[PDB]
Structures are given as C-alpha cells and as structure tokens.
Amino acid sequence: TREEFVSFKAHYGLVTGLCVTQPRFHDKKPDLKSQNFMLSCSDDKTVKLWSINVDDYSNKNNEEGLIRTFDGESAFQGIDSHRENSTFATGGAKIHLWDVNRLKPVSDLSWGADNITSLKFNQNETDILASTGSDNSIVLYDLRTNSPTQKIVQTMRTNAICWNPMEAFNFVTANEDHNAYYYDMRNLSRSLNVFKDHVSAVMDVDFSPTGDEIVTGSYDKSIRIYKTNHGHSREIYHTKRMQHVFQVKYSMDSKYIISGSDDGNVRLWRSKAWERSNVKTTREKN
Amino acid sequence: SKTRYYLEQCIPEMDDLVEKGLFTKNEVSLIMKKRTDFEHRLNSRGSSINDYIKYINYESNVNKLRAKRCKRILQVKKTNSLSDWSIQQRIGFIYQRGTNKFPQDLKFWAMYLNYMKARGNQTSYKKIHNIYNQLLKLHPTNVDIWISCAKYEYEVHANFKSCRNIFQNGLRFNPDVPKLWYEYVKFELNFITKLINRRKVMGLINALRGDIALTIFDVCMKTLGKHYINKHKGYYAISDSKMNIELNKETLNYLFSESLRYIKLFDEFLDLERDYLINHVLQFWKNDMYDLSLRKDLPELYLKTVMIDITLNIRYMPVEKLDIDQLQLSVKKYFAYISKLDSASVKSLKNEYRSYLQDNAEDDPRYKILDLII
Amino acid sequence: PIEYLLFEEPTGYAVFKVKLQQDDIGSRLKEVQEQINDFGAFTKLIELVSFAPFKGAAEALENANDISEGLVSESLKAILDLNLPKASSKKKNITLAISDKNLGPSIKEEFPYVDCISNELAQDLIRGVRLHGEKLFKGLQSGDLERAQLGLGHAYSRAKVKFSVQKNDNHIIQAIALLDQLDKDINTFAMRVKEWYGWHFPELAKLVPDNYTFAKLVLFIKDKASLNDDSLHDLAAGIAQRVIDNARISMGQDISETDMENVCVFAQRVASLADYRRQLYDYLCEKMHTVAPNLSELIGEVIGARLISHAGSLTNLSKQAASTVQILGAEKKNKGRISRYLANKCSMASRIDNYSEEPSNVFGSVLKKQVEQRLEFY
Amino acid sequence: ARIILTMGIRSKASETDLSEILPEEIEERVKTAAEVSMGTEITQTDLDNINALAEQIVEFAAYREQLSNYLSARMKAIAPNLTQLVGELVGARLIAHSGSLISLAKSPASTIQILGAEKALFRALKTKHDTPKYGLLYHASLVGQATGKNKGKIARVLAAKAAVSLRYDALAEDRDDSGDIGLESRAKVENRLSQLEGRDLRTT
Amino acid sequence: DDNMRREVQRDLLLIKHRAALDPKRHYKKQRWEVPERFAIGTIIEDKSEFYSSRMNRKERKSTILETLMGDEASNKYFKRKYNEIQEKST
Amino acid sequence: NPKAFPLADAALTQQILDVVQQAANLRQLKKGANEATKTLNRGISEFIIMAADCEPIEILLHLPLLCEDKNVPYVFVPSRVALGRACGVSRPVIAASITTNDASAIKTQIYAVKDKIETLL
Amino acid sequence: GGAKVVIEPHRHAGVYIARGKEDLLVTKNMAPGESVYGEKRISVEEPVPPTKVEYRVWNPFRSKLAAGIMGGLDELFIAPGKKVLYLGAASGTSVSHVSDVVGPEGVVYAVEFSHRPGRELISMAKKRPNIIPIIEDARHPQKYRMLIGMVDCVFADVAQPDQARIIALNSHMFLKDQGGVVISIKANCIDSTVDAETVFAREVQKLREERIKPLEQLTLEPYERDHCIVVGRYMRSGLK
RNA sequence: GGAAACUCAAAGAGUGCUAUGCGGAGUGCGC
C-alpha cells in the first residue's frame, strides 16, 4: 500500500544502524507471524530491539514498541544479525557480539583501537561476517572461533559491505574511490571485479537476490545497477529530487530497487527498467 | 499459435514409426493432415467435447491399426520404439486437456475414468486417485462420484479403510440424499458378511454383528428427518397448528417409507442375524419424534408396523414345519394385537390371513391351522 | 504465498487454487490493477478447484447468518478439510485467503494447520473473482447468482428484522377491494339473469325482486310446469302461490327451453359467486378481528378495511396524523365535531393495534366507551 | 388458477405436479422458484379462500367456453348461411352493432363493409381525408387470408355476399337451416380470392 | 405523429409560449423546440390528498386547452391585453 | 430494549425538560402527538421528546418510525405530568417537538442537548 | 391534481420531465396501480390493445438525488442498465425512484441499519422486484458480502460522521473499477463546529486519498441547506 | 436528383471469445 505500519522517535541523535530479526527468547514461543521485530543501534550509545504490530495474517483477534534496550559504553555505528540463533553484532568504537537474551556484550571482537564503520553478516555460512573500519580496512570475523580472522587495508575508506546470496564467499565492498569491488573471501589479494563507472563516493551496495546483478548507490545524486560479470553500469537511475543517495537496497524478489536518499524520501524503482510487473500471455512472454 | 507446438510435439513418434517399416510417408502425411485438423478444432475457439471425443476415437483407432500392422508386418507384439507408449500417452493428454477445458460433463469425465481403468493393467491407482480427488472436489454434491469411487476401490483394491473414509466424507458433504446412506449400509453389510464368512473359512481350514448398521441407520433417520424438514418450509419456519403437524407427519411418512425400504432390501442379507436387526429397526421406529405414530396418527403406518412386527418373526418358507412349531408367537402376537386395534383389527386380520395364504400329509395339519387362522 | 482462497457465494462455497502469485510491491500499479479487470489475464492467476453448493435455501440462509456473525458452519468445514492439504509440524503452514479478519480466528481454531490471510492482496483478488464471477465456474453450478441473492437478501432481511407472518394488512386491503368489486358484478349478473329470464317469466321480476332468491328459484323452476305444489316454492321463499298462478296467467313469454339450460347454469353461477361472498366477508371479519382488533371494535370491519385500503396500508394509516384521516362516504356542527372525535380516536386506535406486536381488544373497548360517552350529549 | 388450485402452499411444490397444466420445462422453474421464493407464508384459512377464488376463476372460464359453443350453435340456428359464410363471432358482433337481424337486413352492403370503423370513417369524412376499408369485418377469416389492399377488395365483396346471405336467412320463412347458399357464396368469394391473388402488379 | 398532431398541435405551442400565459410566473428562458418523442398524460391524485388540490368530477376538462378556457378571469386578462395590443398596433 | 428505548436518565431528563420550558416560553415548541408528527413531516423539528409512561405506549411509538426516517433525534422521558409541567400547560402532554428557528435565543442549548442525546443513541 | 401534462426524456436516461404549466420531474413506475410514498402519479395511455402505464413524481424536497438532478448534475451513474448500491437507504422515499430509474433488469442493493424503517422497506420491496433489502450496519460490509455482487455505482445517503470510512470500505469491497460514486454530505451531521465547505473540502480530500477521483460537486442550495452532492469515480488504477 | 441488398471495397468503435503449458513396479535414501 506504500505507507508505514508504525513510526517512532527512536533515539536522540542519529540512527546509525538497523536490521530486522526473528528472535528466539528462552521463555516464549516468539510469534514471528502476528508481530514483526526490528532493532536499531544509534549515536546515543543504545541498541533497541523493537516490536511492530503487523497486519498481514489474520490468525488473531498490544505490545507496540521497545520490548528491551541494550546499553553500551561507547557509540554505535552498525548492526546486523546472524540469521539463526538470534545473535547480532554491532559496530561502534569496537565491535561487540551479543544475543537478545542478555544485556551485556557476549564478546569483544576488534583487532585494535579503530572504530568499525559498518558490518554485515553472511547469508549462508551464517557464522561468518565482515566489517569495515575507518582504518580503510576490511576485517572478516568468524564466530565459531569467536575471532577476527583477516584484514586488508585499501586506499580509501570502505563505506559498506554486502555479501553474496548465491556465491556465499564473494562480497562487494563499496568504498570512497568511485568504484565498487567484488572481492572473493578465500583469496583476498585480488579484488576479482571492479565496477567502475561512478563520479563520487559509493555509499552502499547490495546484491540482487538472484546473485548476479548488484546495485550501488553513491554520494552523487544517482544510483546505478551493475551486472556482476561486466564491471560497468548496466543502468543509471537518477531524479532531480533525489540527492546524496545513501542507502540503496534490493527487494527480495529481484524486481525493485529501494533508494533512500538524503533529502528524506525513500523511493521504489524497477530493476529491469523496461519490463512491466503483470502476468503476461505466452505470446507476449515469447 | 500453440497448435503448432502440439503438432510438432507429435513428430518423433511418427518419425521412428516411418523409419521402421510399418507406415509409409504417403499415409503418415494423411494421418498428420487429419491430426492437424483435429488439433485446430480442439484448441480453436468455441470448441466442444464432441471434438475431443472424435479426437480420442481417431487416436484409439490409429493405435489399433498400429498394433495390427505391427503384428502383421513385423510379426511381433511391439517394436520397443517410442511410438508404443506415445500414442496412448497422448490419448491421456487429450483427456487431461478436455477435463481441464470442460469439467462440466460427467460423460467425458466418466469415459476418461473408464479408459484409465482399462489401461489399469499397466497404469496406476496413483494416477486414478488424483483424478478421483479432483473430480470429487469439482462435484461434491453428485453422489454417483462417491459411489463409483467406492465401488472401484472396493471391488478391485478392497480397501475397506478408504471405503469407510470416502463414505463418511460423502455423507459429510451431503447428508441429505437417501441413496448414499442406503448404499453406505449396503457396503457395511457387504463387508460384514465378507468377514463373517472369512472367519468361517478360517474356522473350516484350521461383537461384529450389525451394530454398525444400527448406528448409521439411527443417524440416517435423524439427519434425513432434519433435512426433509429443512427442504420443506424454505426460508421461514411456518408457525401454526395444522401445517406444523402436517409437516412433522409428512417427514415421519417419508422417513418411515425409507425405513421400510431399508427393511425390504435389508432382508437380502441372509448370512447375519436378519431378524434381530429387523427387530432393532422396528424398536428404533417404535419411539417417535413429536408424532407418536403407533397410538396417535399415522394409523396406516401403525398398521404396517404391526404387520411387520408379526412377519419379522413369521419370516419362513413353504417348508414350514418349524413354523408349525414356532407359530405360537405368531398367534400370540395376532391375538394381542387384535385385542388392541379397533378397525385395524379387521385390517391386520385380513393381512395375516393373506400372509398365511401366501404361506400355504404335511398340508393336513397345515389345513387344520389354516382353519384355525380362518 | 497465498495458495488457496475461499469465496462465499449465494449458491454455495467455492475454493480456488492460486497458480501464479500476484506481484506484491507493484500492487498499486495501473498494469496490475487492470489485470483483475481483464478476464483472460485473471484466469492466469486463479483456478477453480472446488465448489460445494448449498443443499437447500434454508441452509443458504443459515450459512449467510453464520458468515455474517463470523462463525464457521459445517458445510464450510466440509469444503475446507476436503480441499486444504494437511501440513507438517510448523514448516509450510498452508494458507487461505479469506475476506474478513473475524472469519480468521474461527477457522484458525477449527484448523490449526491452516493460516488465514486477509490483506490488500487477498481483498484484491477476492474482488477480482467477485467481478468475474460465474464465468470462472464454466457452468459447474446449479443456480443463477442475481436471483439467488435476491431470494437470499429478502430472507436475510426478514430474519434479521423479525418481520411477522400474520400481522399483515395485505390480506385485508385486497380482500375488501375484491369483495366490493364482486358485489358490483354479482349485481350486474343478477340483473342479466333477470332480463334473460324475462323472456321466460316477464312477470316474475316484479313479484320476486331479490337477486339471490330469484336466481335460486330460477335454478328451481326451469319450465312453466310447477302446477301442483306450494311447499317447495315457499321453501324457496302466498307470494309463491301468486307466482304459481301467474306462471299460467302471465303468458307474455317465449319458451326457448332447448337451450335455457345455459341460463340454468348461469343463475347457479351467480349463486356460487354470491356464496363465495359472505364467506369472504366472514373471513375478513375474522381477519380484522385478528389484525386490527381495536379498529374492528371501534369502527367496525367494513370501515376498518376501507380505512386501511383508502390509506394504503396499516403502517401508513398509523403514521398519518390525526387530521389526515379524512375520507369520503364513511364515518357516519353536531355531526362534524363528533366526526372529528371519531377520526382522531380511530387514528389513535390504529397506532395501538399497529405498533403493538400482538394486539388486544381492551383499548378498543375503552375507546368505544369514550366516544359513546362523548356523543351522549345529544 | 389451476396451478394454485393444485399447489396451495409453495412448500408442497417439490413433490406434487403433473405436466398437463403446463409444459415440463416450466415445472422445474416452479419448484426452483418455490425454494428461492421471497414470499411470505399464509394460513389454511386464507389459503382456502384464495383456493375458492382460484376455482371460481376456473369455473368462470369453463362457463365462458361453453357459452362460446352455445353462441356457435345458436347462430347456426339463427342465420345459418351467414355463419356458413363469415364466422359466428363476427356475425354475432354484427348483430350486436345492428340491433335486430331484420334491422341489419334492411341495410346496404356498404354499411356492412363499414359497420365497425365508425369514428374513423366519420372523422375521415370530417377532415377531407380518406376513409377506412374494413369496418368490423376485418376479423373475418377470408379477409384475414387476403394479403395487401386486395384484403380491402375482398372486404367489399364479402360485404356484398354477406348482405345477400344475411337477408336471405333473415327474411326467409322456410329455409333449411343448412347454410346452402351461404356455402355457395363462400365458394364464390373463395375462387374470387384465389383469382385475385393470382394478380401481381409487379412484372415477371 | 401527424395523426394525433391535430389534437395536440395547439398545446405544445402554448407550452412553448408559457412565458406570457399568465402575468405572474416568468418561467426561465429556454427555446423548447417540440421534441421528437413525448406523450400526454393526466395526473392522478393521492387518496389522502382531498379538499386540497383534487379537481372535481364535472370540473375535469378533458384537455389542457379546455382547462385553460375554463377560468374567465384569465380569459379576461387575455381580453384586456389583446385589446390594448390591437388598439396600439392599429 | 423494551419499546421506548432511548430513555434518558435523571440529569439529561432534567436538562431537556428545562430547554423544553424555555422553548415553550419562546414559542418554539409544538406539543402533542399529532402536532408533533405534523411538524415532523413539515420538516421543521429539531428533536422530539416523548413521555414513556403513556396510556398505552403505541400512541406515541408511531413517532420513531417517522423521526429516524427523517433523521431527527428522539428521546423518551419518564413522566407525562413532568412533561406537562415543563411545557407550561395544564394537561399532561406526551409528545413535544422543537421547531427549527435560526432567530432563537436558545440555539446553543438546543445544540448541546442534541449532541448529548445523539451520543445517547 | 387532475390536469394534463406532457412527458419528455431528460438528459439522464430513465428520468423524465413532465412539462405542464409548472413542470415536474418524474420516473417510470415499476409497480403500476399503486403509490408507495404519497406522491402524485401521472398516468399515460399508450395505444395492439392499449396499455395504461404510470409515472411517479420524484419530489426534490424529499430525496437528495432528485435535488441534485434538477439542481443540475453533469452526469450521474444511475443509468437504466446499471446496478446501484444505496448506502443508507432509509425508506421508500428515494430508493423507489432509484429502483425504477434502474428498471426491470438491474438491481438496487439498498442497505439500512435501523429496524423499523427496515421492515417497512422490505414491505415496500415485496412490490417491486429489482431491489435487495439489507438490514445490516454499513460499517461492516464483511457481514453482507455474501449477497451483493460487483455493483457499478454507489450512492451514499448515510448521515453519520464516519462517511469517508463507510464509503471507502464499501467501495473497496463491492464497487467495480471505473465505477460511479455519488455522495450526499450533510455538514451539520459531520461536524457542526466548522463551516460547510470546510467540511466539504475535508471529505473531498478523504475521497481522493481513498482514490475515488471527484469529478463534480453541487450544493443543491434552493432545496436543502448545507448538503453537497459529490460525484466521483473509483479510479483504482492510475488516479492521475 | 432521393430509396431497397445476401450489392462489394475501405477505415473506426463497441460487444463478446479463454486470449489459455522409457513404463508397472520392486530396490535404499528424501519428514
């Protein structure tokens, strides 16, 4: 319908990270179908795990916001969640791993004294994750050994990681030199593709869920969508009202591109910009 | 045009069927001509089931000619080519297309079913169960669907568990038709005599009486009365004296006519306690539903109930010497009923007279008892 | 993930499988909201897989009541557990698309292996299948939907409002508008019997003037051959004896006896019509004693039926004010103010025996005593 | 009236009818309309009252049919050549507009051509316009069988032969009650009609 | 058509000329050419409507032209205005 | 829900009776059942008041079927003699109706009473 | 009350003008030989054996649709082919005229919540075939979804201050696409505090946020104070 | 010069129309 379920004034300062969760408490069947949980870490040294009374099912007929709060001694910058066992991870002045059952960081994880600008879990081999620090550095962590496991330093600062849903050991870094880098994981010395055609800092990126077409949104007022095995722009989307587009993500059916800008608005786009989204008779399909 | 897709789907079987020497191209082009016309008439607009029927008939006939020239020219039963399964699998494909396009007519549904039964040597009840399932879902109300399904999977598979399941399902979907209740009781006594004589076979070579039929008869009478009284008085329950009483006695009339049908084709079963179950039927018919059929109104039904109560013990044959031994209960019942009824005394007397006239040196004491009854 | 939907129709329930899923993000687009108006591209979404009609119209009204109160009925239970596949433990919970969040939890309780969806997408393809309707079934039904919901609508309205079956002036208005007309035409036909039998008895018409006794004795004496008795003639009735003498002294008469039998059948036809009258009149005397007993006791059955006919209906007569109970002919200065008194008394009586659901007579009696004590000034 | 006289309450309609009253494809309409019927219910008292009116309508219809047979037999007794020629209903309507049989016997055949279209004739005189050509006589079978304006022509010749036969059996004193010259004039107008339906003004 | 147009050929022209039929109305301006499909017809009265706007039995003139001929005060207005028009036009 | 359903409690009864009294003194009130239904189908009726102890009750119960058709609010009060004293007249009235008038001095009190009785129903 | 008046077809099909000295507005009756409401009927005679057919006078002081008609609407959606969902059908005041301007072929699903006007409505409804009486509350169209199918115009004479939610829910459930919407708005029953066209602006904006595009409005001022007839169409796809 | 059709030709709009995708088994796994 293109409107919100609910909205909240979450934190005092900026919100710097938020994800969604299917939590598991040890004292509840967590009903992940009548209500829906997100969470967010922010600038005011707090992480908040939040409920949403969603209306998609009709199994029932109330506990709207802020089911619990986590408190950290320094600020926070990034969030993502291990997509099993309700363990999520935050980038702040140091990267902390914690689950939703205890109000303390279950692990410190950093290399040394450098903040963690973003991070992202994996979609498969979910125990592994990556992060990007303001040392212009990519650091991979493995939570089985509960340890960081390799770091590379690049020239300019990596804005945002996103893993591959299909390849599962390839990710994409978007950094501030004006190109995104399709890295491997097992051989981190050759960034096995470079998607080049931008003019300013590339703010985030994610894959299509079909795993072969990625989308970068950059600090110039334009997003663009890349094929995986080319390295140049398949297509450029821009409009006059969008400006300094910061967070672009790919909807879970590989059809729409959600672009949240800096002027406030969040927009929908098609991925294949010429196709249309109705069912087609087989002569049209052919 | 998907007709081109079907028409060049059918090319490789005729390719192999020509390159082995049973047809020539000068006539496989003719059958391709007629197949082209049939496919066009089929998936054109405004088509019909008769077009599907003629396509099925033509493909079965060219299948039979294929087998005929196979055993004539090649002198074998089959040539293990692609064709031998292909022609009947596309017959089944035509059947599937016709059921999807026209799920109305049970004639085409039924001959799909009959062809799959006759192929049932090779093919599967895994395939049969699916088409019975979707036919059952498209027609829940039609009772012959459930009856033919039960007849098939009890008179080939004999799976009494599934037959009980689908009869309970059919009565769940419509507990209104008398025929489904009737044939549920028919299957019940069928397998009850089957396993009585099965344990008789076990007893030869080496509890479960009609209480099930009693229970389903009782719920049959209750549900049938509820559904007749709801079939009448369509939208609004009419509230007066005489129309309310007439509707209750009309329901009782139709219900007890149905229990009379239950009795009169219940006595076909001889391998069970037929008299005890007919006694249970009359005992359930004794106490009434807001009408009191015996002493109050429906006196003709009370008279037929009394005559059935006498004849349920008087069920005998021409060789009636054991009836001459055990007709004391008959004379006692006729006396105790003539001592109750007023003009049904005359009716029951004439009825027992005609029944004894149907019953009639061994004729000599029988003539004595005949003068006693007269 | 919308695998099945349940559509509730006047003739019975239908359950559709969903072949292709509609698009979820672009659901407010023109090219998606037009494919639920194109039928040949709506059938690429939705396949009919079951349709159980209601057995009787009483069960149709019962299912309409149970859906309107959001309950599950037994035919609905039957079609749901026939069509919906049983799932495993919690993986792949099967999914209906129903039309209301109140029918949601009830079938969730009846089927814990079934999940119910009623969002914009569910209501979208629900209204698609409602729009196309009977074209989906391709004749697989016994019923036409507009006339079926006509009957179901009047039934559901009547059962919701508890509209009475006896409290009904529609008998009485056409009953009185029937009997005045047939009084007129039996007068016509008796005059025609009179002028026809004047060719056989030109003298009897002045001696026996009454219509019913006239026709009943015309059925008695066919030809002028009475000649002997007075007993049966007085039983049809001295005047008998004068008619007997004038049958042989009048003689200003033809015979036409070979086809006077049509006059014999015609006079008894007038007899049967005039005897259907007074038993219709007895019927509506009882019907005004049962429907509007205060009106029948205050003003009488004839003026009561004329009043509710001349007003149009009983409720219209009641909701009429006391001054607009003016009429012509009925309500039999010193007559004017007592006519006004009787007028607003009978309007009040009409209000009583209309809006009372099962009226009594005692208030009609006290109104009668009031108006007679009022006119007793004279 | 017969279907209410058989039926009574629409509740009974699912189990009692017979298709001599009406064709069989309408009986299923009657039973389906009985179960989807939006009507109320009534009692046995008003049911038998309208049942009595139903049989009243049936009896009056049967009386009307026997009166028509009565009229046929009696006009065949009165003016047998006339009803041999024209028809009993139209002959009775002509005598009804006439008065007595001799009172239209003393009439020109022009009047018997126009003895029904009175105000149309007189208004088509009044305004200087064109007269009608049928009168009441249009409902006779012969002028029905004629097609065109030759039906007006046969209306004229049937008026003439009707005047002949009419005053024959009016002022006869011993005629045979058989319609002999009425039948003769019928054959005359019939062969007249065929030999003017042979005519067609369009060429061949 | 032109078979009853003789009977109704006046009244549609005066309904076109309603603007001056009575000097107390001033119907709003429209031309109202004679339409292709129309039908005459009379009001019938509500049975509760009585003493108020029902016209009597011998008062029911069977044409609108005859009903307009009825009241001689209206015809008097017609007479005086046509007379002043005639003397001012001669 | 017996027959005269929207029956006012004590405080609302008293404020509608005092607005009845000042309406009657302002000559904005028409009293009695048939004058009430006459002004109801004239169309000038702001809300109507009916005394639900009348002899019997149907003589005014004809009025809901007109008033809820024509969308005016209707209240019952518990006493005819209370309504008569509040109308300022010697005999017990049972029905009363406030004629609509924009030249009234009681217009805001009328509207407050109307809002309270419409929330009552 | 006995004079003779000519008939003429209006712009909208189904409704007729009766031009006499004064000129009425009228409709062709479904049930001849009767007057339901208390209106005057004009009876004409069609000349085959001759028929006698009657026409009920539509009172614009008693039905807001007839107020809007002779106040002048550019188009309705009550055509003599269509089907009409009458929200808030009180009585046989206006629903009879909407019924017989629809005609013998199409249905008017009239709804109503109150019980006394409901029972006289069904007693009206037995005498003409094409209307369907509903005795449900209009706030829950789910509890009468069983029995109305895909109506192609809605009329709304409901007078309670959640009109926008009423018409939104009913039009989403039953009104077909590109279908008609006709609203009668009563400012004193929506809210008496603020003025009439302010609440008209509020309700027009609530319509076009419920994607009923409003084409036309009318104040109907010489007949009733402070109502507005808003005609719009359900766009549902491409509001722009 | 105006008017009949199954006279034909050419465009347009509306209503429809579905417009419409090795095998029996047996043998161990797949909850």
UniProtKB/Swiss-Prot annotation, chain B:
One of its GO terms (molecular function) is identical protein binding. InterPro entries: HAT, TPR-like_helical_dom_sf, Utp6, UTP6_N. GO terms for cellular component: 90S preribosome; nucleolus; nucleoplasm; Pwp2p-containing subcomplex of 90S preribosome; small-subunit processome. HAT repeats lie at residues 86-118, 123-155, 158-190. Keywords: Nucleus, Repeat, Ribonucleoprotein, Ribosome biogenesis, rRNA processing. Its main location: nucleus. It is found in: Nucleus, Nucleolus. The keyword Repeat applies. It comes from the Eukaryota. GO terms for biological process: endonucleolytic cleavage in 5'-ETS of tricistronic rRNA transcript (SSU-rRNA, 5.8S rRNA, LSU-rRNA); endonucleolytic cleavage in ITS1 to separate SSU-rRNA from 5.8S rRNA and LSU-rRNA from tricistronic rRNA transcript (SSU-rRNA, 5.8S rRNA, LSU-rRNA); endonucleolytic cleavage to generate mature 5'-end of SSU-rRNA from (SSU-rRNA, 5.8S rRNA, LSU-rRNA); maturation of SSU-rRNA; maturation of SSU-rRNA from tricistronic rRNA transcript (SSU-rRNA, 5.8S rRNA, LSU-rRNA). Component of the ribosomal small subunit (SSU) processome, or 90S pre-ribosomal particle, composed of the 35S pre-rRNA precursor, the U3 snoRNA, and at least 40 protein subunits. Component of the PWP2/UTP-B subcomplex composed of DIP2, PWP2, UTP6, UTP13, UTP18 and UTP21. Interacts with U3 snoRNA. Interacts with MPP10. Belongs to the UTP6 family. Present with 7520 molecules/cell in log phase SD medium. This is U3 small nucleolar RNA-associated protein 6.
UniProtKB/Swiss-Prot annotation, chain C:
It is found in: Nucleus, Nucleolus. Keywords: Nucleus, Phosphoprotein, Ribonucleoprotein, Ribosome biogenesis. Its main location: nucleus. GO terms for molecular function: mRNA binding; snoRNA binding. It comes from the Eukaryota. Residues 291-378 form the Nop domain. GO terms for cellular component: 90S preribosome; box C/D methylation guide snoRNP complex; nucleolus; nucleoplasm; nucleus; small-subunit processome. One of its GO terms (biological process) is box C/D sno(s)RNA 3'-end processing. The keyword Nucleus applies. Changing V325A: Reduced growth rate at all temperatures. The modification Phosphoserine is found at S313. Present with 13500 molecules/cell in log phase SD medium. Belongs to the NOP5/NOP56 family. Interacts with NOP1 and NOP58. Component of the ribosomal small subunit (SSU) processome composed of at least 40 protein subunits and snoRNA U3. Required for 60S ribosomal subunit synthesis. This is Nucleolar protein 56. It comes from Saccharomyces cerevisiae (strain ATCC 204508 / S288c) (Baker's yeast).
UniProtKB/Swiss-Prot annotation, chain E:
Signal peptide: none annotated. It is found in: Nucleus, Nucleolus. Belongs to the FCF2 family. Interacts with FAF1. Essential protein involved in pre-rRNA processing and 40S ribosomal subunit assembly. Required for the early cleavage steps of 35S rRNA at the A(0), A(1), and A(2) sites. This is rRNA-processing protein FCF2. The lineage of its organism: Eukaryota, Fungi, Dikarya, Ascomycota, Saccharomycotina. The chain holds residues 110 to 199 of 217 of the full protein.
UniProtKB/Swiss-Prot annotation, chain F:
InterPro entries: eL8/uL1-like, H/ACA_rnp_Nhp2-like, Ribosomal_eL30-like_sf, Ribosomal_eL8-like_CS, Ribosomal_eL8/eL30/eS12/Gad45, Ribosomal_eL8/Nhp2. GO terms for biological process: box C/D sno(s)RNA 3'-end processing; maturation of SSU-rRNA; maturation of SSU-rRNA from tricistronic rRNA transcript (SSU-rRNA, 5.8S rRNA, LSU-rRNA); mRNA splicing, via spliceosome; snoRNA guided rRNA 2'-O-methylation; spliceosomal complex assembly. Pfam families: Ribosomal_L7Ae. It comes from the Eukaryota. It is found in: Nucleus, Nucleolus. The keyword Glycoprotein does not apply. GO terms for cellular component: box C/D methylation guide snoRNP complex; nucleolus; nucleoplasm; nucleus; precatalytic spliceosome; small-subunit processome; spliceosomal complex; U4 snRNP. GO terms for molecular function: RNA binding; U3 snoRNA binding; U4 snRNA binding. Its main location: nucleus. Keywords: mRNA processing, mRNA splicing, Nucleus, Ribonucleoprotein, Ribosome biogenesis, RNA-binding, rRNA processing, Spliceosome. PANTHER family: RIBOSOMAL PROTEIN L7AE FAMILY MEMBER. Common component of the spliceosome and rRNA processing machinery. In association with the spliceosomal U4/U6.U5 tri-snRNP particle, required for splicing of pre-mRNA. In association with box C/D snoRNPs, required for processing of pre-ribosomal RNA (rRNA) and site-specific 2'-O-methylation of substrate RNAs. Essential for the accumulation and stability of U4 snRNA, U6 snRNA, and box C/D snoRNAs. Belongs to the eukaryotic ribosomal protein eL8 family.
